[PDB]
Design a protein around this ligand. Structure first.
Ligand code: MG
Ligand code: MG
Lengths: 807, 807
């Protein structure tokens, strides 16, 4: 019988703390010089306009005395030489702001709830942004007071956003610092001459800045609940989730140095729809007879989702503005795209709960799930569970232990299914694919051909191509799971804890698996392939207690270990290497994702060390010496072994909570100890040449590369050629990825009601919080963030200020 | 403090009662014969396969003895001769079904409402249908009990429909009965040879049957209401109306006799969006001092609507099914379409109500409206009103008249604005229009041209074309309105009535007005053009009374008259004829839509009657004699006068309501007396040749056309040529369109609560209703429905059965 009102608001800041340091224009000039003289080549013959003052020292070893650079990169003086920091140029402080206002009404014969919210992100990446209006409104109505009840939930979201382009950050670390942001006039800068065929990342963002989608989503449900006698309940629910995304993606002409669009201009008007509806019926019966308590429940749930998308594309526009650029206004050619897919799910289920004397618990569970992603012959799968419970401390013989409030012992066994696969997983798919979609450097795989020799100017004849081969025998991936647990609490709920042991084993694992080469186009197949096992230990422990000095602490920890192992694999998949082993060793009996590769044994420091080692092709002074695993006297494809295991030795987490003088302080720490990580980062930071495209910007670790002048370094000598195949899977790319970081720290003041209800307001609280602030890494880790070792940039820190006023 | 529940359900039937009777295969054969011999032509030389046995009578006049027809229409025997009734073939009984379930909850501190509804129409036209799911959910919350209130309304509709093709019915009355529905095998029938180039209407529906749109609409509003002291109120409202329509329109190959697609196949995936948001603030203050009562109110309202549509079109599909036919799967050419438009409205307003002694009322009103459809120089317009009231019977001197409960006298004066015009009304619009949209028989008006002589096979150069000429001086259409009223009630509310008099005059009327020919492409202009006046009389009268014999009657009538007149018109518009006068006389001083034309003076019955009449070109025996209005001795373009006025002499309406033994009977009658109507219907019913396309099916009135054998008939002699220009605007097409019809009759039983609350249900009512059942027309009207004289088909009757159970 109340009416309650909450209002929450906050503003957040997001700032990139660090990044992979990449070479500046002089360091880039120094590095290329070193890679030149390391190869006995005239460094003054470079294609990039650097002029080097150098010579030989007293021991006859290249030393760089000085270097000059043109004012402009090109003879025509349209592009000036720069020292651009591209990462700082395309990033900025993100700012987030949220406001939520809620109201609820409690009444004898019903209830109703209402929320309005707003959320605006100006992303850390320039020319991006995001906003979400939201409204939720729910209610219930007690007819036939307490035997027939009707209700509803509903929410409604409008979202609009300009997403960044994929890989925008990495391409900013890739483009050299000599290229300026702006040309000699005010146009967008770019590469001239031999500089990399990579466009201006800032200019790419500006050209992206108008590509904004508008996303509308509603989802709710309506239900009736019939209670015909004391313990019985019939409930039916109908659900609906309809969203639609709309956007225009604008293509504008560009011509920035050698980069060019010709004069292309186009617009694509994209539309997407997703409608998902759900229905269930459920019958539950509870009953209590002195000691015995029992609950039964049966149900059913039909699910459907229908998807569809489609677009219109058209080229050539007189006026390069969003106002002008609609398909009606284009004068060049047009393409029309679009398709749809869908899936349906039937679900039958039941449960049975029983408890003798709040001392012995037992629960049973049974579920048939059916899914249109399989043929009739595997459409349904049935999954049971048994869960068992013994509350020791309730037992009579446990009377004597007063320092033990609870000691529960649970043991479970259950199966669940995996079904997340393509909606066409089971089909051999032939698509017409005439060749109307963009694609890079070729690779249309179009079926249209000028069979007459016309040279075009019309509809070509065309046909069909294969996208995948079907599977008449594709079935559910089944996971059988077993865990036994011991949770407890001692003293007077001051020392709570739990010790669990789980053993999950997956069977008939589902993967889209590619095909063999000679089978050719569209050989990919959706298959059930082998079995995995994952068993481990979890052990959470807590300590909560006040100090009677004004302080409450509540310290909650968690440490876990797990080991993982593949058990069976079709012979073809094991040599393929999908699950690990890199195509040289089968990963059966090893952990999922473990890798075989060469072992990097340092750097040859003398020619004698080259001759004194098994013969290997690129072996030379300054190169990486790779180990002769089998001792045959040559380094070839067999000189590989297991060199990477993703299994951490353990993973932990500790949560500190303090209340004192109405202040409150919270810290969330999470750690991972003794874990291999594997990365390509080092191919950009440690090599001038470990890359298919030349003259890209590289990391700053290069300037400590190996040299006669610099003889005791892990980093191989700079070179313009990867003759030694140092891009080979090797321990050079495996690093100690152990870490410990503060996910969140947060301090808040709760305003005492003596002063807050001043304002006819119950609660009023201010909080300040910070995410991803601190990280402690291994010394021999050389990346940015060990938890995400593939990235050359970290997660940005967030500072937030907020209030939770509450009437 | 309640909880209330209504449930309404009904099923309706819709059946076309009558239609313009069109010729059957023999009547069509008879008619063409008559038109042949009437022209002294060998009727056996027709191009349609009829063979006629005929000759001359005793007086030497053609008489048809018999006629035969092939078994098949074509020499190759693929199309059999038929007597198809096409109207019966493409129509059926429509059935409608609605179900609505509502629940509301009233509580001290708030309220909430919830409705679910369903509506399914299988239309009277085959291969059409329509359905609407709907959910409404509203609620309010009394914070700061009765000074600060928060609320919300929201509704949500999903609609899906296959619309009929435009003019499907008329084309079924147009295609001759000799063409069969099915070919000799099971394919779709069509015309062969000389038969009209019109496709099979049934086959058109089947090809349309999969073109289904899916329409989602939500609209609601959220408001806060602040009442700071006793009479004051601040209210703000935010509103939102977002709908989106989605569809695929399928083009399938056809080849039915001479009708052909070649082998065309295509799909168009169309998308539309309409988002409309609204915001207002309003401040109201009420105050009462003994006799004086006064109310003031000020406010503001911003409005915006943004629209956008776009599609993708693609030709050529291997599999002619909706499952297959998405743009991705097409192999032919593609087109991309789409655009957007929008408008915004600002609105400032105020009102002032005052009443002395519930004897004298006065209200004032002021509103500035601004609209982005005008330039800054006419953006806003200001509108006032004065309304005045005197309650006579409350006056002291009116004490003596007991047979007079009320006698109110009201008098008003106010202005409102018209603003419904194109969003680009004020612009000179150049569109690129390359020529990518379908168009009939040419008329692309594309700007693309093969300027090089290539003959195509590429993007052509192209340009811009004009759609309309702008108007720097376009302004609001203003309507000044004045009405004085006298409403009353006598005895003891048994004889209620009202007598009103209104005088609305519009100024600066807005029309898209075309341009002169020599100005050419895109000469259409949005202009303010002249003034109109519309003044009339309304007089409603009622009589309600029970009988004390178990019967209540409540009889409510209405009779109205109006006369309309144009006052000023730019000289160019008056000779144009947009508002009337057919380009021969100015309609100034006449009613809107009145027409000048020739006067049809019967039918020449002898050559002497032809010579004895002013010389007119097509004059011959059996033709229409047209009057020599000016007596110059020739019939030419001056022999015209005013021959049509749409003003009815009056229009009435009577409503009967009866309650008796819990039954209830309702009849709604509406009439229009003494009114001209004007129609083209007669060109299909009365002429073999009053049409640009030959050999179409015609009405059955032809078989009473004029002939020597049939000399006393209004209908001119059948002929293959309209030499006499009987398609000229003439009194032949003007008819007495007076009518009286029963809009609705309805009978219902209300179940007495003695038996209904049996079921814990308050009210339970059954009703049966019928729409458009009866119509009484003028004898000298020859169409189907005088109220809609352009159509050759009536409005179908609806029988409905329904219940209104109410807990
Ligand atoms: Mg070896
Ligand atoms: Mg004349």
């Amino acid at each position: 019988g109340q009416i309650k009102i909450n209002f929450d608001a906050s503003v957040s800041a997001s700032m990139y703390q660090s990044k992979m340091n990449v070479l500046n224009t002089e360091q880039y000039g120094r590095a290329m010089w070193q890679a030149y003289v390391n190869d006995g080549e005239n460094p003054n013959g470079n294609a990039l306009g650097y002029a080097y003052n150098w010579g030989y020292n007293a021991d006859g070893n290249p030393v760089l005395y000085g270097m000059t650079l043109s004012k402009y990169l090109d003879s025509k003086n349209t592009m000036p030489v720069a020292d651009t920091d591209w990462f700082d140029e395309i990033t900025r402080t993100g700012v987030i702001q949220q406001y939520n206002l809620s109201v609820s009404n409690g009444s004898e014969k019903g209830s109703s709830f209402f929320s309005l919210g707003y959320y605006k992100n100006l992303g850390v990446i320039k020319d991006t942004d995001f906003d979400r209006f939201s409204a939720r409104m729910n209610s219930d109505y007690k007819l036939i007071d307490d035997i027939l009840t009707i209700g509803q939930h509903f929410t409604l979201n409008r979202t609009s956003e300009v997403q960044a382009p994929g890989g925008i950050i990495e391409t900013a670390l890739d483009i050299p610092s000599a290229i300026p942001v702006y040309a000699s006039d005010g146009s967008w800068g770019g590469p001239v001459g031999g500089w990399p065929d990579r466009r201006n990342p800032r200019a790419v963002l500006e050209y992206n800045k108008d590509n904004r989608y508008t996303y509308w989503r509603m989802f709710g449900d309506a239900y009736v609940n019939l209670t015909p006698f004391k313990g019985f309940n019939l409930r039916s629910t109908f659900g609906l989730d309809y969203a639609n995304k709309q956007a225009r993606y604008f293509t504008y002409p560009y011509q920035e140095g050698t980069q060019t669009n010709n004069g292309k201009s186009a617009v694509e008007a994209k539309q997407e729809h997703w409608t998902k509806w759900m229905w269930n019926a459920i019958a539950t019966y509870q009953l209590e007879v002195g000691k015995h308590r029992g609950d039964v429940m049966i149900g059913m749930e039909l699910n459907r989702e229908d998807d569809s998308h489609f677009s219109g594309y058209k080229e050539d526009f007189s006026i390069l503005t969003p106002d002008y650029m609609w398909p009606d206004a284009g004068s060049g050619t047009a393409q029309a795209y679009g398709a749809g897919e869908g899936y349906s799910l039937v679900s039958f289920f039941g449960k049975m709960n029983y408890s003798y004397a709040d001392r012995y618990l037992l629960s049973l569970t049974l579920r048939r799930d059916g899914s249109s992603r399989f043929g009739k012959n595997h459409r349904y799968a049935t999954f049971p569970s048994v869960s068992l419970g013994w509350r020791i401390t309730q037992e009579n013989f446990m009377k004597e232990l007063t320092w033990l409030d609870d000691l529960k012992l649970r043991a479970s066994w259950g199966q669940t299914g995996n079904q997340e696969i393509s909606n066409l997983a089971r089909y051999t798919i032939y698509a017409p694919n005439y060749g109307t979609t963009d694609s890079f450097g070729g690779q249309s795989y179009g079926t249209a051909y000028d069979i007459t020799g016309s040279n075009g100017g019309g509809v070509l004849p065309s046909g069909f191509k294969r996208n995948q081969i079907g599977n008449d025998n594709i079935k559910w991936e089944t996971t059988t799971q077993t865990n036994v647990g011991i949770d407890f609490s001692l003293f007077k709920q001051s020392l709570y804890g739990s010790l669990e042991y789980y053993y999950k084993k997956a069977t008939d694992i589902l993967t889209e698996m590619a095909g063999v080469g000679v089978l050719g186009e569209g050989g990919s197949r959706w298959i059930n392939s082998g079995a995995m096992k994952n068993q481990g230990f979890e052990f959470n422990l807590g300590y909560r207690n006040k100090t009677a000095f004004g302080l409450t602490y509540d310290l909650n920890g968690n440490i876990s270990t797990y080991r993982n192992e593949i058990l069976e694999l079709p012979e073809t998949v094991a040599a393929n290497g999908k699950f690990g082993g890199n195509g040289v060793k089968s990963v059966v009996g090893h952990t999922y994702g473990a890798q075989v590769g060469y072992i990097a044994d340092g750097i040859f420091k003398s020619q004698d060390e080259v001759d004194n080692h098994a013969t290997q092709e690129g072996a030379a002074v300054g190169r990486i010496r790779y180990r002769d695993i089998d001792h045959n006297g040559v380094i070839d494809e067999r000189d590989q072994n297991w060199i990477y295991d993703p299994t951490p030795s353990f993973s932990y987490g500790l949560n500190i909570y303090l209340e004192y003088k109405n202040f409150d302080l919270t810290m969330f720490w999470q750690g991972v100890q003794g874990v291999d990580i594997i990365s390509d980062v080092k191919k950009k930071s440690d090599f001038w040449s470990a890359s298919n495209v030349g003259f890209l910007n590289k990391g700053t670790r290069l300037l400590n590369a190996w040299s006669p002048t610099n003889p005791n370094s892990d980093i191989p000598a700079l070179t313009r050629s990867d003759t030694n195949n140092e891009q080979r899977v090797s321990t050079y790319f495996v690093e100690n990825g152990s870490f410990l970081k503060l996910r969140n720290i947060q301090l808040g003041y709760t305003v005492p009601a003596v002063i807050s209800k001043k304002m006819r307001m119950d609660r009023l609280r201010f909080y300040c919080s910070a995410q991803n602030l601190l990280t402690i890494k291994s010394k021999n880790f050389t990346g940015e963030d060990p938890e995400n070792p593939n990235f050359s940039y970290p997660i940005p820190v967030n500072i937030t200020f907020g209030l939770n006023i509450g009437f």
